[PDB]
Amino acid sequence: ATIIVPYMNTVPFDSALNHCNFGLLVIPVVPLDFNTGATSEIPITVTIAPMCAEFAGLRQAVKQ
Amino acid sequence: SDRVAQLTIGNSTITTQEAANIVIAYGEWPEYCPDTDATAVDKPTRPDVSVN
Amino acid sequence: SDRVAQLTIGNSTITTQEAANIVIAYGEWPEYCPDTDATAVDKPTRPDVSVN
Amino acid sequence: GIPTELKPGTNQFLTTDDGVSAPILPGFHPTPPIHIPGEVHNLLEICRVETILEVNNLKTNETTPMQRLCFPVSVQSKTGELCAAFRADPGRDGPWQSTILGQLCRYYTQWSGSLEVTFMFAGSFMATGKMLIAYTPPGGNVPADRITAMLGTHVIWDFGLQSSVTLVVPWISNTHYRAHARAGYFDYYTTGIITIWYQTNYVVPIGAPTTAYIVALAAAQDNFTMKLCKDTEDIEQTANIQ
Amino acid sequence: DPIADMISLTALQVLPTAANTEASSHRVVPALQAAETGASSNASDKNLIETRCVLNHHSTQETAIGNFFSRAGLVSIITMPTTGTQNTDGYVNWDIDLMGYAQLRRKCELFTYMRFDAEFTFVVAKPNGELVPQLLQYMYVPPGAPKPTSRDSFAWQTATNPSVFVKMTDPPAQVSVPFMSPASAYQWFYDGYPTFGEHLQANDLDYGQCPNNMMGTFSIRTVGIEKSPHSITLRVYMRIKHVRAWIPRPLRNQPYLFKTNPNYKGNDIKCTSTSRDKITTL
Numbered sequence: 210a211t212i213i214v215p216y217m218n219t220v221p222f223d224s225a226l227n228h229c230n231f232g233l234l235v236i237p238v239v240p241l242d243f244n245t246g247a248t249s250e251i252p253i254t255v256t257i258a259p260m261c262a263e264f265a266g267l268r269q270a271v272k273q
Numbered sequence: 274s275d276r277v278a279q280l281t282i283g284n285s286t287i288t289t290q291e292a293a294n295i296v297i298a299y300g301e302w303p304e305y306c307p308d309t310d311a312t313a314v315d316k317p318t319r320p321d322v323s324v325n
Numbered sequence: 326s327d328r329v330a331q332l333t334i335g336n337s338t339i340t341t342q343e344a345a346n347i348v349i350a351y352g353e354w355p356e357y358c359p360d361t362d363a364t365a366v367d368k369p370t371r372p373d374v375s376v377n
Numbered sequence: 378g379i380p381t382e383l384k385p386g387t388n389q390f391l392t393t394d395d396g397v398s399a400p401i402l403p404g405f406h407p408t409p410p411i412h413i414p415g416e417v418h419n420l421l422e423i424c425r426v427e428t429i430l431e432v433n434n435l436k437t438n439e440t441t442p443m444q445r446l447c448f449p450v451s452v453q454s455k456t457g458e459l460c461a462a463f464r465a466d467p468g469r470d471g472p473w474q475s476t477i478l479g480q481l482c483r484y485y486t487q488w489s490g491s492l493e494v495t496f497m498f499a500g501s502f503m504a505t506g507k508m509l510i511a512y513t514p515p516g517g518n519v520p521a522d523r524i525t526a527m528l529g530t531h532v533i534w535d536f537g538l539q540s541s542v543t544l545v546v547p548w549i550s551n552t553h554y555r556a557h558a559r560a561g562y563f564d565y566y567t568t569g570i571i572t573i574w575y576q577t578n579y580v581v582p583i584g585a586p587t588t589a590y591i592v593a594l595a596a597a598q599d600n601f602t603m604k605l606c607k608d609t610e611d612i613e614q615t616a617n618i619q
Numbered sequence: 620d621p622i623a624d625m626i627s628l629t630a631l632q633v634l635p636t637a638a639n640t641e642a643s644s645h646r647v648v649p650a651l652q653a654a655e656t657g658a659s660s661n662a663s664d665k666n667l668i669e670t671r672c673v674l675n676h677h678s679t680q681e682t683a684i685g686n687f688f689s690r691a692g693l694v695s696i697i698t699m700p701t702t703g704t705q706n707t708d709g710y711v712n713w714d715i716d717l718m719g720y721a722q723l724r725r726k727c728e729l730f731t732y733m734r735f736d737a738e739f740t741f742v743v744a745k746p747n748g749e750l751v752p753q754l755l756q757y758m759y760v761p762p763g764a765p766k767p768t769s770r771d772s773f774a775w776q777t778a779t780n781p782s783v784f785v786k787m788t789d790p791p792a793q794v795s796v797p798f799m800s801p802a803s804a805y806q807w808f809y810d811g812y813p814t815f816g817e818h819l820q821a822n823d824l825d826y827g828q829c830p831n832n833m834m835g836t837f838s839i840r841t842v843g844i845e846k847s848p849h850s851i852t853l854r855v856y857m858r859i860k861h862v863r864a865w866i867p868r869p870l871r872n873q874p875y876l877f878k879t880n881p882n883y884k885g886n887d888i889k890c891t892s893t894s895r896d897k898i899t900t901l
């Protein structure tokens with residue numbers, strides 16, 4: 210599945226540390242099922258790409 | 274033939290074929306912040322490829 | 326009045342007054358690499374303010 | 378007679394000198410040429426042709442060489458495992474030696490340009506799965522985990538989708554040309570590392586093999602060129618040919 | 620008129636320098652190829668990544684088959700010793716076969732057919748590299764021409780065959796040779812027999828022998844009624860020129876054993892590539 214997401218906030222820019230603009234949810238609404246003998250390891254992988262990244266207010270590095 | 278695809282950005286490329294098309298949240302494309310909405314006065318840095 | 330000065334780049338500014346003018350090495354200004362001289366094919370990242 | 382002075386070089390025989398020597402058969406006319414398909418004018422025409430990469434070049438294969446022509450993928454029990462890794466250095470000893478490209482560029486001292494590797498999945502049609510293929514430019518050794526390798530140039534492939542996929546190895550060098558890389562000072566001209574990881578997993582239903590193989594094909598792109606013609610180390614007159 | 624049933628797509632292009640690279644961005648399925656067809660991926664940089672413009676002036680002139688082949692290489696070593704089993708006769712007849720030296724051979728066998736003219740250079744000296752005032756005669760004896768049976772043989776009259784007379788002290792002798800096959804091209808591989816008939820195991824040395832490649836004999840001698848006191852070593856170098864080639868093929872990956880066939884050492888079959896311990900470790 211693929212979803213493009215635009216920036217959403219009540220402010221133009223914000224801290225990437227103190228505020229999470231949104232969450233991504235992956236929920237099995239219809240449970241996984243298969244006959245025994247078929248591959249049981251069914252992984253889910255998430256790949257994301259930020260778009261139009263902009264940063265401002267340069268200073269020293271802060272982890273939180 | 275909507276399933277068949279390939280999106281490239283930066284030095285990375287995804288090839289999706291059992292795709293269910295693509296969703297553009299709330300019908301809007303991402304975009305750098307426009308001057309009318311902007312508030313902070315320093316010139317922002319826009320790294321491009323290394324981050325997008 | 327060559328001593329008197331002030332150079333700004335990025336979010337930093339120097340104010341020099343007992344300066345002895347400024348030297349441009351070998352008479353050439355720094356410049357991003359031109360396409361004729363370039364060899365590597367990937368698109369370079371040019372951070373600008375955060376690094377310069 | 379006309380005043381002349383012999384200069385250094387006089388009497389020498391330079392194997393690569395392109396001069397004019399006297400003809401032994403005056404008035405001779407060669408059998409005329411006829412049309413023959415497949416004429417080639419420049420070696421590069423050949424380097425653009427995919428040949429098989431011996432990615433599975435193990436010491437345990439040497440006696441059953443056919444096995445080197447393809448490597449396996451199978452149902453993983455652990456996520457994000459590493460499937461295979463190898464250097465992109467084409468003129469270097471290793472997987473590339475098996476390709477017409479590698480053999481040919483060994484007849485030249487330097488090269489330049491982009492390369493492409495195509496992977497073909499030869500598993501059953503019922504098998505599906507996604508792989509992450511990455512090219513890590515010089516500097517970093519083999520990425521320890523998929524999350525590290527993912528930071529480099531990569532492609533995310535899906536079988537069910539297409540049976541083959543092409544990874545491009547962009548020419549990313551400091552110098553305009555690279556000499557053949559090898560251990561030592563010449564490791565400076567290394568091209569980098571290619572890694573293949575499990576993005577999701579090799580999934581198959583009841584009734585189909587849990588292990589299948591992939592064939593790797595490699596060749597050069599249009600911007601590829603070579604210079605400084607030399608002798609290949611890949612052939613030897615070990616004994617006398619009778 | 621009273622009967623109604625009785626009434627190449629690819630071409631060349633001149634590319635002096637390597638193709639360039641054009642810029643691209645964040646945007647049709649060109650990454651996934653159908654290599655099952657027997658085609659090489661037509662996918663380039665601009666497709667799989669974001670690129671910059673690069674004005675590539677790298678030249679492709681050195682990879683032209685002409686610059687690759689027109690480099691003189693050793694194709695034969697002929698010796699005329701004075702004391703021994705070889706030729707204490709003062710003359711030697713050599714059947715022309717250039718497949719006795721690998722370096723050159725492997726290069727030619729990259730192609731199935733080749734047509735060209737050639738420059739032969741004759742480097743002669745004593746076996747230790749020393750030179751002496753000795754007069755020699757090299758003669759080309761085409762198929763059918765009488766071969767010298769001695770240093771005195773009438774054939775050295777060379778009234779029609781071409782001969783070269785030179786001193787071991789003069790520079791190397793050098794001449795140009797035309798394309799002499801009776802066929803349109805020399806062929807390094809001939810999947811067949813030269814004649815009709817049953818091909819019993821006694822005459823299996825026939826397989827692969829192509830008459831169109833057999834250019835005769837090359838004879839040499841010291842020019843004298845009397846025997847010469849000097850052992851002689853003749854190295855023959857060949858420089859291909861005005862060449863055209865067809866049908867590329869896999870490059871030899873096993874040591875050569877014989878001039879006339881691709882036989883290989885079956886017990887020690889070399890792998891094209893070096894080996895390592897694991898497929899996941901460099």
Ligand SMILES: CCCCCCCCCCCCC/C=C\[C@H](O)[C@H](N)CO
Nearest residue numbers: 715716717718757758759781783832834
């Ligand atoms: C006085 C100068 C004499 C020089 C004459 C030399 C003529 C040699 C012609 C070149 C022929 C090309 C070689 C052709 C075929 C290969 O040797 C075959 N594999 C031998 O069976």
Ligand SMILES: [Cl-]
Nearest residue numbers: 466468557558
């Ligand atoms: Cl290399």
Ligand SMILES: [Cl-]
Nearest residue numbers: 771772775776
């Ligand atoms: Cl005589």
Ligand SMILES: [Cl-]
Nearest residue numbers: 685860861862
């Ligand atoms: Cl030529």
Ligand SMILES: [K+]
Nearest residue numbers: 378379380381
């Ligand atoms: K005179």
